[PDB]
């Protein structure tokens, strides 16, 4: 279907504790596929996914020197902002950037973009039109006006519509196979003390991928919309994820409640009950 | 492929 290539960049300063830490992470369809950390010994632009190891050392050297160069401009920007905001040089700060494009199954551009953030707050963004900017405060206006006066958007656009796309095309060919991987969840239910006239039933789903999943409880066909306990889908630390949901049902009435699990990997939405 | 970021 649709795909996208993005780059998440962070530049964080460590006042009088060395140079700022620069990290550029690359994603394809939300899957990290390349990375560059400056705090690594002899920094290199490492391939994060196997299907990437099929690129020539020429590419790896190119992208490494690109990052190093960006790491430099960023080291400068940090100081520039420091002055836009009149902030002590002694405090630490952060610049984050998100750049990339999202293309449709037709291979056409659906949305390109570039957003900046300073200390966790949106700084400036490139608009839908890929021609204008939107500043989020007095400081960003300066960058805005400069970038207007320099044609930055035009150059940036040129990258989002072309360079960025073509490379998304190339990465996908070498790794679509892998990007299709899917792991169906395994589910079981658990009964819990919960002292009183009630009990807790926890519906577990583990070892699944992608992280997208939905867990829901039912009482004799009708669905439960209240007092459902859920936990943010979490990484099992082995490529797969896990998540659970629970409800405190009146004791005895265990059977009357059933759990449901929907996941693109499953051939069909499994149904759990808890079996004594 | 990365973008050549400019200055803020």
């Amino acid at each position, epitope marked *: 279907g649709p795909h996208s290539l993005r780059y998440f960049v962070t530049a964080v300063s460590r006042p009088g504790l060395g140079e700022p830490r620069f990290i550029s992470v690359g994603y394809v369809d939300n899957t990290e596929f390349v990375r560059f950390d400056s705090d690594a010994e002899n920094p290199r632009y490492e391939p994060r996914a196997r299907w990437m190891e099929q690129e020539g050392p020429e590419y790896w050297e*190119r992208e490494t*020197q*690109k990052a*190093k*160069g*960006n790491e*430099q*401009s960023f*080291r*400068v920007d940090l*100081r520039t902002l420091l002055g836009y905001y009149n902030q002590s040089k002694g405090g630490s700060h952060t610049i984050q950037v998100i750049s990339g494009c999202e293309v449709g199954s037709d291979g056409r551009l659906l949305r390109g973009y570039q957003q900046y953030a300073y200390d966790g707050c949106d700084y400036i963004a490139l608009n839908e039109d890929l021609k204008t900017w939107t500043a989020a405060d007095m400081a960003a206006l300066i960058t805005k006006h*400069k970038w207007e*006066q*320099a*044609g*930055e958007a*035009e*150059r940036l656009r*040129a*990258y989002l519509e*072309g*360079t960025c796309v073509e490379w998304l095309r190339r990465y996908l060919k070498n790794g679509n196979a892998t990007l299709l991987r899917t792991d169906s969840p395994k589910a079981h239910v658990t009964h819990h003390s919960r002292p009183e006239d009630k009990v807790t039933l926890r519906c577990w789903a583990l070892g699944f991928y992608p992280a997208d999943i939905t867990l829901t409880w039912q009482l004799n066909g009708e669905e439960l919309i209240q007092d459902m306990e859920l936990v943010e889908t979490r990484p099992a630390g082995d490529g797969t994820f896990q998540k659970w949901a629970s409800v405190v049902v009146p004791l005895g009435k265990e059977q009357y409640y059933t759990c449901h699990v929907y996941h693109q990997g499953l051939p069909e939405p499994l149904t759990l009950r808890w079996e004594p | 492929s990365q973008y*050549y*970021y*400019n*200055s803020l």
Partner: T-cell receptor
Amino acid sequence: VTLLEQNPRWRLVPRGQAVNLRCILKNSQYPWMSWYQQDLQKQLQWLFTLRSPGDKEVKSLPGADYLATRVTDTELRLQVANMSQGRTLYCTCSADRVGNTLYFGEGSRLIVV
Amino acid sequence: QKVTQTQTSISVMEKTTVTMDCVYETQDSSYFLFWYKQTASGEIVFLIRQDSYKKENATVGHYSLNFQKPKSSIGLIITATQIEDSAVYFCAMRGDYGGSGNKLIFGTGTLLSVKP
């Protein structure tokens, strides 16, 4: 009405005598400064680009050994040493890292006497 | 990264169309072509620029470029020349990536002589 102030404008010197050039930025909108050499054949070549106060760097082209430093946000220096042939040094300023809008100063014509 | 200008010198009458060639080389997908002027006083002056990602030829003053991406050519076209245009025209391309930006690569230079 000019962006950079380059000094000394010219210099006559006996081969080997070291020479100190200085460049002054008269506009905060072009903090990206660089050094360019133009040899006696009128050929321009880039030497350095120092953006931050503190940045030091050396390079050696045939005929001269250089050493430039971005002393302050407004002062960029250069130290020409062991000069064997004439050359004129150009100081340049640009709005940002990308460039594409670099203005050349008047230069520092250095002559070997 | 070999921007070259073959013409050592060009002498032509005023009010005449003169075209100064410049061939270039770069691997970068995006880049920038430039044309500068130097006078007897010894000062360089920016004339016009070209953006690799614009299919149309740039235009400023009476200067015009014949950008031909497929043939890496980007000559300068000075129309209705005059006694002031007489100077040395340099052709330059900004390109390498990272340690470039403010690193232009200049051509050998071509001296235009506009005969009155």
